[PDB]
Structure 1
Amino acid sequence: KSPALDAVVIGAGVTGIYQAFLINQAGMKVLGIEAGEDVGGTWYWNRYPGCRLDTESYAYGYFALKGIIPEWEWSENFASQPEMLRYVNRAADAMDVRKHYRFNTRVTAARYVENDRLWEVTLDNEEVVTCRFLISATGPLSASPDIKGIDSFKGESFHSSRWPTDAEGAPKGVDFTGKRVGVIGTGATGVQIIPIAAETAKELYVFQRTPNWCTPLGNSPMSKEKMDSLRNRYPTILEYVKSTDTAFPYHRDPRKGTDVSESERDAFFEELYRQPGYGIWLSGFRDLLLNKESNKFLADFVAKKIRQRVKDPVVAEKLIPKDHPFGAKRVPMETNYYETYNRDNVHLVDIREAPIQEVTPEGIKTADAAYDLDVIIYATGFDTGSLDRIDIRGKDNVRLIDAWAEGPSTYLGLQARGFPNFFTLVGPHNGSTFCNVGVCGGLQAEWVLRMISYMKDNGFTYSEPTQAAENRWTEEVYADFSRTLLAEANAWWVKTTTKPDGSVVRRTLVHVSGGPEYRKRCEQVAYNNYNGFELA
């Protein structure tokens, strides 16, 4: 049998809708599927107070850089969620892409049918569509707590992954006047929520096990003159972000930390720290993430600034990580976060030394005290992937989740052996963790378009990585990872298995190779007739 569609794209975040647009544009039959009511992905689902980009708006706005909505005007240097959603909606208007999508629809299963070289996609556990190619754009991140009696709390509970919204689409109940509020989690979302909650809360208790390194965002409104000169510079901006390791508008200093004196370093860090955006991390010395000494130079500088900004030295010290290097995790940026602790009604609770024994009807119970609360905010982190919710079955009925149980195994981060004609766009296993996804995801969608077109042009109906290509690729991805500070720092990012026979397999959950070098490899493969893929 022949499939009804050339492709199904799962997801209508920035990645999915661009893939669908490209495929329709090339004259092929695409159906998008989205669980929500409309486009946006991240920017549709996440509506908690202070939700905002870490990437310069202009750099994230690939659809404007690529001339799809070249006239777009950013109002802020780092756009809030509502502005981001307007951006994605405007892009979708211009792409005329909503008409290819079925919204309010979940893919629950997808099954490869060997004899027909197609995928059977089950929607909402009932209807089945068939496509030659299945393309996942289901999100590089998933909702992340492990404490008794959470459901027993009799006040208002808020979860940042599913913040309640009103009729407009704005967050519900962010006015905390008269309320004692407890926040669990000081990761990226916690450091955005904490300062805002503190504006109105009667009291605010922050339950922190271990701190993250955070740096100031430096956000400000975008003037008309800046926005115009940016747009005039788009051709250079595009070429620049295509050429940096992360696709952020930053590149590392060519010197090592020791190439300069303590005096120069301090002045260098001071200047970076006060500059809006990720410069402090991404413009740092070349060995920042390769050398413990070099990393300590910066980590000690950031500590110094945290002690400057927090008045109480006891509290200051609890906000400074002693257990991991700076820049081992996508660093959260913040707007007046550390200053929040200077408020009379803000209290830091160290739950490492006094762990939470249970959430109770009245609040939170640690080993050391009872906190009577009206509100608990679960400012919960991020990893388990977006694909696990789908029962994906490849050849011989193998489950993707079993295929990847000892860690992701792919060729080029895009296809897995066992699962022909299936592309996995934008995920930690192909570089989303440290990427400007706006740009990285766009370029990846373009590469997938070119492979599908090549197959169409050549009459190929089957693609699957060989065992050798997959194994070498995955080993090489791990080898890249292991040469950095991330490997010792993030233990859970490496799956180590000892096989029956006795071989030891090491795989990283997170691909950290530079984008340009990654894409150069992908073009080497594409030009040489998709070497490493069995095509038929």
Structure 2
Amino acid sequence: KSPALDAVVIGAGVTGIYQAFLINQAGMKVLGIEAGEDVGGTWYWNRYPGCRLDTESYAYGYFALKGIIPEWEWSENFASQPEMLRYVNRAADAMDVRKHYRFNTRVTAARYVENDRLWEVTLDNEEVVTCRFLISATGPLSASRMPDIKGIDSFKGESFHSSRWPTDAEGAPKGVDFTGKRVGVIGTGATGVQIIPIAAETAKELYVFQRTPNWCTPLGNSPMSKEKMDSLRNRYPTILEYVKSTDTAFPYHRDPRKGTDVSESERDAFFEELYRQPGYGIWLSGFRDLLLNKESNKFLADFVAKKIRQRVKDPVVAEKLIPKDHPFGAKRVPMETNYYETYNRDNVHLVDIREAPIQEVTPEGIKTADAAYDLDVIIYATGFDGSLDRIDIRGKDNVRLIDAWAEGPSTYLGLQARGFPNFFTLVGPHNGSTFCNVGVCGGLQAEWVLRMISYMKDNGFTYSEPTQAAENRWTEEVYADFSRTLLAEANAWWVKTTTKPDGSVVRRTLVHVSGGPEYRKRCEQVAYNNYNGFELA
């Protein structure tokens, strides 16, 4: 029996529309499925106040760079979500991709039919579609869910989660004016950190509930003159080759020096100067051993801590905002606009919930182990888990994807897992998303998958699956690259260790950290050598 589609793509964010575009372009039949009303993914769903890029708008906008909408005009150096959402829509216009999608539609299950080499795709636990290939693009981050906190539904005031902020007919967020309300914000990752300073401008009082501080550095956002935009657009051919060559696809690359190759004075100037420069330079232009060597990371950590005490009046407030938990850059660094100067305000309080954990949410507000906080509003900036885990994906022998990866994700090329043939996992932590400029990384990985699909069609092949040897090898290499860096002991739960009954040890990182150009090259060695490592029939 023979599938109705060549490919189904789940997701209509930047990654998934580009992939769907590419397949219809190569003249094959594709069906996109999306949950939301429309294209956008991240830029469709997150509508919280202050939601902004951390990647230069000109560098994230691969669709402009690639010549699809090159005439696009960016209004700031780091676009806000509504502008981001307009960008994705215009790209969608140009690709003409929407007509290939079913919106308002959840994929509930996906099952591999080995007799027929195809995937049955279940829409809303109702309709079934068949495709030779299934491609997930379901996003590097999973879903809005309540945090694990008792009493949530009892609060008698307004309760927002950040990824589900209510909007008006215009699509703009509502209840953003907190005049004369007492507001609680839970979470200080990148989302909290964007929301807080804006919530502070109008709230009567504002309580920040923080389990662990992150390291955050200044965004340095500013408007984009028309002159600059034209200039950038003319240099798109160069910027593209440039972003294509850096390890993150950020327009930054590491300093060629070790930290100790300079004196203390010289490191200081170097740090001072980057710190004051917009964007991620402070992180991604740093010394080459910044994430490899404790002493090198301590230089910059110390420096950022100093900046934090400079910007925070109250010494005791400040030292709670400075991590000791962890090395600098060992998570994706939140970027901010006056985040620290918010806590200098009279009406703003930092609540340390490590020392005093939330005990529960109350019709009145919030209870910690040792105080109670009356609130008129609670905003849940509690972040995300993966996204595939919410679909019942079953491969050969009816094995669940979830069980296959219990001991850690296991793939070849971060793109297919053994047991799951003809299935591609685009953009996820396990193929690099965590530290990528995903506008670019995601786009390049889609074009590769398009190349493999086209090769299978051209040779009349209908079946692909990694061998066990090629999968074990890649997975051990991904782990090994990851162990050489500081993140390995930083993020204990990013590593799955299993000691199987036979008494053997398996190590897998949840997070792939190899450089992008080096990873794409290994992909191209594979593709050119007739997809050596995949079984093909």
Give me the whole-angstrom Cα distance separating, in 2, the residues matched to 1:248 and 1:215.
Answer: 16
State the SS of the aligned residue for 1:129.
Answer: strand
- Structural mapping, 1:291-370, within 5 Å: 291-370=293-372
Give me the whole-angstrom Cα distance separating, in 1, the residues matched to 2:400 and 2:359.
Answer: 37
Superposed CA offset, 1:10-52 (max 9, x none): 1100000000000000000111111111100000011000001
Superposed CA offset, 1:92-119 (max 9, x none): 0000100111111111111111010000
8 Å Cα contact 1:178-1:201 kept in structure 2: yes
State the SS of the aligned residue for 2:435.
Answer: coil
The aligned residue for residue 84 of structure 2 is 84
The aligned residue for residue 485 of structure 2 is 484
Give me the whole-angstrom Cα distance separating, in 1, the residues matched to 2:317 and 2:123.
Answer: 51
Give me the whole-angstrom Cα distance separating, in 2, the residues matched to 1:105 and 1:375.
Answer: 32
Name the CA shift for 1:101/1:222 in 2 (closer, same or farther; >3 Å). Answer: same
State the SS of the aligned residue for 1:28.
Answer: coil
What's the offset of the Cα at 1:323? 1.3
What's the offset of the Cα at 1:381? 2.0
- Structural mapping, 1:19-418, within 5 Å: 19-143=19-143, 145-383=147-385, 385-418=386-419
Superposed CA offset, 1:366-392 (max 9, x none): 122111111111111233x11011100
What's the offset of the Cα at 1:352? 1.3
State the SS of the aligned residue for 1:161.
Answer: coil
State the SS of the aligned residue for 1:246.
Answer: coil
What's the offset of the Cα at 1:143? 3.5
Give me the whole-angstrom Cα distance separating, in 2, the residues matched to 1:440 and 1:350.
Answer: 37
The aligned residue for residue 430 of structure 2 is 429
Give me the whole-angstrom Cα distance separating, in 1, the residues matched to 2:240 and 2:384.
Answer: 29
What's the offset of the Cα at 1:147? 2.5
Give me the whole-angstrom Cα distance separating, in 2, the residues matched to 1:115 and 1:155.
Answer: 55
Give me the whole-angstrom Cα distance separating, in 2, the residues matched to 1:445 and 1:349.
Answer: 43
Q: Which runs of 4+ in 1 moved over 6 A?
A: none
State the SS of the aligned residue for 1:405.
Answer: coil
Give me the whole-angstrom Cα distance separating, in 2, the residues matched to 1:161 and 1:207.
Answer: 18
8 Å Cα contact 1:7-1:29 kept in structure 2: yes
Superposed CA offset, 1:132-155 (max 9, x none): 110010000013723221221111
Give me the whole-angstrom Cα distance separating, in 1, the residues matched to 2:189 and 2:412.
Answer: 32
Superposed CA offset, 1:482-526 (max 9, x none): 000000000010001111211111100000000000000000000
What's the offset of the Cα at 1:86? 0.2
Give me the whole-angstrom Cα distance separating, in 1, the residues matched to 2:187 and 2:118.
Answer: 44
State the SS of the aligned residue for 1:9.
Answer: strand
State the SS of the aligned residue for 1:190.
Answer: helix
8 Å Cα contact 1:48-1:193 kept in structure 2: yes
Deviates more, 1:517-526 or 1:167-176: 167-176
What's the offset of the Cα at 1:208? 1.0
| Structure 2: tracts of 5 or more residues without a match | none
8 Å Cα contact 1:47-1:163 kept in structure 2: yes
Superposed CA offset, 1:414-467 (max 9, x none): 000000100000000000000000000000000000000001010100000000
What's the offset of the Cα at 1:351? 1.0
Number of matched pairs:
535
Give me the whole-angstrom Cα distance separating, in 1, the residues matched to 2:474 and 2:81.
Answer: 36
Give the CA RMSD over aligned residues. 0.7
Give me the whole-angstrom Cα distance separating, in 2, the residues matched to 1:377 and 1:15.
Answer: 29
8 Å Cα contact 2:19-2:450 kept in structure 1: yes
What's the offset of the Cα at 1:306? 0.4
Superposed CA offset, 1:234-281 (max 9, x none): 000000000000000000001000000000001000000000000000
8 Å Cα contact 2:178-2:199 kept in structure 1: yes
State the SS of the aligned residue for 1:121.
Answer: strand
8 Å Cα contact 2:63-2:70 kept in structure 1: yes
8 Å Cα contact 2:65-2:240 kept in structure 1: yes
Deviates more, 1:352-361 or 1:342-351: 352-361
Give me the whole-angstrom Cα distance separating, in 2, the residues matched to 1:176 and 1:90.
Answer: 33
8 Å Cα contact 1:161-1:380 kept in structure 2: no
Deviates more, 1:374-383 or 1:197-206: 374-383
Give me the whole-angstrom Cα distance separating, in 1, the residues matched to 2:2 and 2:356.
Answer: 62
Give me the whole-angstrom Cα distance separating, in 1, the residues matched to 2:447 and 2:28.
Answer: 14
Give me the whole-angstrom Cα distance separating, in 2, the residues matched to 1:371 and 1:100.
Answer: 50
8 Å Cα contact 1:143-1:380 kept in structure 2: no
State the SS of the aligned residue for 1:450.
Answer: helix
8 Å Cα contact 2:143-2:387 kept in structure 1: no
Give me the whole-angstrom Cα distance separating, in 2, the residues matched to 1:296 and 1:358.
Answer: 37
Superposed CA offset, 1:287-312 (max 9, x none): 00000000000000000000000000
Give me the whole-angstrom Cα distance separating, in 1, the residues matched to 2:352 and 2:487.
Answer: 25
What's the offset of the Cα at 1:357? 1.6
Give me the whole-angstrom Cα distance separating, in 2, the residues matched to 1:117 and 1:146.
Answer: 41
TM-score, normalised relative to structure 2: 0.99
State the SS of the aligned residue for 1:194.
Answer: helix
Give me the whole-angstrom Cα distance separating, in 1, the residues matched to 2:341 and 2:411.
Answer: 45
What's the offset of the Cα at 1:322? 1.1
Give me the whole-angstrom Cα distance separating, in 2, the residues matched to 1:136 and 1:425.
Answer: 6
Give me the whole-angstrom Cα distance separating, in 1, the residues matched to 2:368 and 2:102.
Answer: 47
8 Å Cα contact 1:218-1:277 kept in structure 2: yes
Give me the whole-angstrom Cα distance separating, in 2, the residues matched to 1:445 and 1:357.
Answer: 45
Give me the whole-angstrom Cα distance separating, in 2, the residues matched to 1:119 and 1:499.
Answer: 32
Give me the whole-angstrom Cα distance separating, in 2, the residues matched to 1:500 and 1:491.
Answer: 23
8 Å Cα contact 1:358-1:366 kept in structure 2: yes
